[PDB]
Design an enzyme around this catalytic site. Structure first.
Site, short mmCIF file in Angstrom:
data_model
loop_
_atom_site.label_atom_id
_atom_site.label_comp_id
_atom_site.label_asym_id
_atom_site.label_seq_id
_atom_site.Cartn_x
_atom_site.Cartn_y
_atom_site.Cartn_z
N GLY A 1 0.78 -1.22 0.00
CA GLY A 1 0.00 0.00 0.00
C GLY A 1 0.82 1.28 0.00
O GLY A 1 0.30 2.35 -0.29
N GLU B 1 -0.32 10.38 5.93
CA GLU B 1 0.27 9.15 5.41
C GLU B 1 1.41 8.66 6.30
O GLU B 1 1.96 9.44 7.10
CB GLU B 1 0.76 9.38 3.98
CG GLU B 1 -0.36 9.82 3.03
CD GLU B 1 -1.51 8.82 3.00
OE1 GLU B 1 -1.28 7.62 2.69
OE2 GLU B 1 -2.64 9.24 3.29
N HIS C 1 -6.22 11.05 9.25
CA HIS C 1 -4.84 10.60 9.28
C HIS C 1 -3.99 11.38 8.28
O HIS C 1 -4.51 11.97 7.31
CB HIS C 1 -4.76 9.10 8.96
CG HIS C 1 -5.07 8.78 7.53
ND1 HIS C 1 -6.35 8.88 7.01
CD2 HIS C 1 -4.28 8.35 6.52
CE1 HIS C 1 -6.32 8.54 5.73
NE2 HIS C 1 -5.08 8.21 5.41
N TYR D 1 -9.62 -0.34 -3.14
CA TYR D 1 -10.62 -0.12 -2.11
C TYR D 1 -12.02 -0.24 -2.70
O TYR D 1 -12.44 0.63 -3.48
CB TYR D 1 -10.46 1.27 -1.47
CG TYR D 1 -9.11 1.56 -0.86
CD1 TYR D 1 -8.02 1.90 -1.66
CD2 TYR D 1 -8.93 1.57 0.52
CE1 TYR D 1 -6.80 2.18 -1.12
CE2 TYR D 1 -7.71 1.86 1.07
CZ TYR D 1 -6.65 2.17 0.24
OH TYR D 1 -5.42 2.44 0.77
N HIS E 1 -6.45 14.06 6.37
CA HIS E 1 -7.64 13.88 5.58
C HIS E 1 -8.46 12.74 6.13
O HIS E 1 -7.95 11.88 6.88
CB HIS E 1 -7.30 13.62 4.10
CG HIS E 1 -6.26 12.56 3.89
ND1 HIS E 1 -4.93 12.77 4.17
CD2 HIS E 1 -6.35 11.30 3.40
CE1 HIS E 1 -4.24 11.68 3.87
NE2 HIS E 1 -5.09 10.77 3.41
N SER F 1 -4.93 3.31 -4.68
CA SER F 1 -3.99 4.29 -4.14
C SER F 1 -2.62 3.72 -3.77
O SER F 1 -2.45 2.51 -3.61
CB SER F 1 -4.58 4.96 -2.90
OG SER F 1 -4.44 4.11 -1.78
O1 LIG Z 1 -10.05 5.10 -0.39
C1 LIG Z 1 -9.83 5.22 0.85
O2 LIG Z 1 -10.24 4.39 1.70
C2 LIG Z 1 -9.05 6.42 1.33
C3 LIG Z 1 -7.59 6.17 1.08
C4 LIG Z 1 -6.81 7.44 1.28
O3 LIG Z 1 -6.73 7.95 2.43
O4 LIG Z 1 -6.23 7.96 0.27
NI NI Z 2 -4.61 8.61 3.18
#
Ligand SMILES: O=C(O)/C=C/C(=O)O
Ligand code: NI
Ligand SMILES: [Zn+2]
Length: 345
Positions: free
Chosen positions: A162, A182, A180, A169, A268, A280
């Site tokens: 990841g 990253e 959070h 997702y 975010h 992602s």
């Molecule tokens: O698609 C999500 O669950 C979010 C992933 C992210 O924080 O980029």
């Molecule tokens: Ni993220």
């Protein structure tokens, strides 16, 4: 971007071809200050010809999201369910029990989200190793963006799922991602392959510390047990609560076929509107390195991701290497500055 607002960009096909160049560009336009930016790709471009060949792909560890809380403050507990196919998931997702409610304006769907967050716990097909890009897409390919984050694998052979590999997702209505930044406060890129929208909240990096201070005050027990408890990705905080306590933030909704970029130390969070699919991974620029050096990490070993900064400092900050190794590098981060590669712009 003195307002630190979420910006939206429409690169031409020529601009789209060099990933790092364009990230350096949107930063020259102040995008990073919001913590989050949307990039709408050229209409010509497509990562896959068709998404009809994926109904039999396995979701190894679907997650049932239980949420407990009240008054805009919530904690999300994960319950792992048995494996499942994309077909099965969509079937559950579109069922009457779990599907999107009817609504007029987005503001209404958002209210229902924050009102019914703790009821009828949904299932999220999250953290699925894999990519949906066709092998030959060379533009913005999440599997191979070719940024300096590649130095981690290149130097040590280490892969972190990841982070320098892609995740998929599969969401349904009311599935959430908690507040959070990253791992190592890296960048991220998020592409919504198809389905209903994904809505985002963001706090500017220059105000990140305010949000942490607020969160420590609302979760003193979690705060005492871990120096970076928000990295557990379990804490949900509604926009009304942020507003109530003067934390600046912005909102944006992501449509299928759109990219979101998050920036170093950009907090975010958000939720999915209904059945959808997103991909992602993380990436880096030279500006990230200092963030990497100073990232406050999870101290209770629930979040294990720790990347060695040594190769980065040696290669890109040779004059500070000896100082840094001796713990006397007191560089201060200015969140408004763009990455150096944008000197060209
Ligand atoms: O698609 C999500 O669950 C979010 C992933 C992210 O924080 O980029
Ligand atoms: Ni993220
Ligand atoms: Zn922790």
């Amino acid at each position: 971007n003195p307002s630190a607002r979420i910006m939206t960009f429409y690169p031409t096909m020529e601009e789209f071809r060099n990933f790092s160049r364009y990230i350096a560009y949107i930063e020259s336009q102040g995008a990073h200050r919001a913590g989050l930016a949307k990039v709408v790709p050229p209409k010509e471009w497509k990562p896959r010809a068709s998404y009809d060949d994926i109904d039999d792909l396995v979701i190894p560890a679907p997650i049932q999201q239980l949420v407990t809380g009240q008054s805009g403050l919530f904690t999300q507990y994960n319950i792992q369910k048995k494996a499942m196919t994309v077909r099965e998931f969509r079937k559950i997702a579109n069922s009457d029990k779990y599907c999107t409610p009817r609504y007029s304006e987005f503001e209404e769907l958002e209210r229902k989200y924050w009102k019914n967050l703790t009821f009828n716990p949904p299932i999220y097909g999250a953290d699925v190793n894999g990519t949906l890009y066709e092998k030959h897409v060379d533009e913005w390919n999440i599997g191979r963006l070719r940024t300096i984050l590649d130095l981690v694998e290149k130097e040590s052979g280490i892969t972190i799922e990841g982070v320098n590999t892609p995740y998929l997702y599969f969401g349904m209505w009311k599935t959430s991602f908690a507040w959070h930044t990253e791992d190592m406060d890296l960048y991220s890129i998020n592409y919504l392959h198809f389905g209903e929208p994904k809505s985002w909240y963001s706090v500017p990096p220059e105000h990140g510390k305010r949000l942490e201070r607020l969160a420590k005050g609302f979760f003193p027990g979690s705060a005492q047990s871990c120096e970076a408890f928000l990295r557990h990705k379990m804490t949900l905080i509604s926009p009304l609560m942020l507003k109530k306590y003067g934390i600046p933030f912005d909102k944006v909704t992501q449509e299928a076929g759109e990219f979101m970029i998050t920036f170093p130390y950009g907090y975010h969070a958000g939720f999915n509107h209904g059945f959808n699919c997103a991909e992602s991974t993380n990436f880096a620029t030279r500006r990230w390195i200092e963030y990497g050096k100073q990232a406050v990490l999870c101290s209770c070993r629930k979040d294990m991701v720790k990347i060695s900064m040594d190769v980065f400092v040696r290669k890109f900050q040779p004059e500070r290497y000896k100082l840094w190794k001796a713990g006397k590098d007191n560089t201060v981060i200015d969140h408004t500055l763009p990455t150096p590669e944008a000197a060209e712009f």
